[PDB]
Each structure stands twice: as structure tokens, then as C-alpha cells.
Symmetry: C2
Subunit: 42 residues, 2 copies
């Protein structure tokens, strides 16, 4: 079975998306972005 | 798009670094090694 999880990742590390891009700051991380993960257990 | 090996329980997720290769005789019930297809935006 597959799990679809919205993630906050930089291509290497990865975390669950909790709204990291929902900031009032003028700045943001260069390498990190919001993405969708299709997770398949091996 | 990238294909990452991850350590996750279906809710929280981390990059897989061999978290399941421990000396303990116990393991987390819900966590497992998985393949994650990451699609930007």
C-alpha cells in the first residue's frame, strides 16, 4: 500500500510539512521546498 | 523529481540512515524503511 504525505524537504533531508513556508519573514530557506511524497514500504 | 529512501511511520518522516539496524532487541512498532517519490510544489 502507498501513503501520500505532504513533506518539507531539501532533496536530501525531509520532514512532515507543517506550514514551514507560511512565515511572515521576508526570508526563506534556499534549498527547502514543499512537496508531495508517495511513500511505499520496502 | 527525486526518489529518496526514508525512515517513516506514515506520519513523521526522516531521511533513512539505517535506523532499523540497531543492537537492541526491540524496535518501533509503526516505523519502517520505505521509498518516497518526492515531487516539488
Amino acid at each position: 500500500k502507498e501513503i501520500i504525505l505532504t513533506v518539507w524537504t531539501n532533496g536530501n533531508a525531509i520532514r512532515k510539512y507543517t506550514g514551514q513556508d507560511k512565515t511572515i519573514s521576508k526570508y526563506k530557506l534556499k534549498d527547502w521546498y514543499k512537496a508531495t511524497a508517495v511513500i511505499t514500504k520496502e
